[PDB]
Ligand binder design. Structure first.
Ligand code: BTN
Length: 72
């Protein structure tokens, strides 16, 4: 559902399975080879799963989130 958009490392994560999110809410942050990039919820919903965690490696198009309200 929500995915990373840049090569980097998932510096922080702010979501868990069962948590509520809203479009534009911060859900993770990239370090990106010493740059900083907020990762915000592409849509509102309840998180079904988080496909990554704090400090995991990530890339453009690499998954981040699955939601019980994207399933629609
Ligand atoms: C390079 O020196 C290794 C660590 C890089 C950490 C980066 S710098 C930009 C991001 N902000 C932060 O606090 N840590 C990330």
């Amino acid at each position: 559902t929500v995915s990373i958009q840049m090569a980097g490392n998932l510096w922080k994560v702010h979501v868990k399975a069962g948590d509520q999110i809203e479009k534009g809410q911060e859900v993770a942050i990239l370090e990106s080879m010493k740059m900083e990039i907020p990762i915000v919820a592409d849509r509102s919903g309840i998180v079904k799963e988080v496909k990554k965690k704090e400090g995991d490696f990530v890339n453009e198009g690499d998954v981040l989130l699955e939601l019980s309200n994207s399933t629609q």
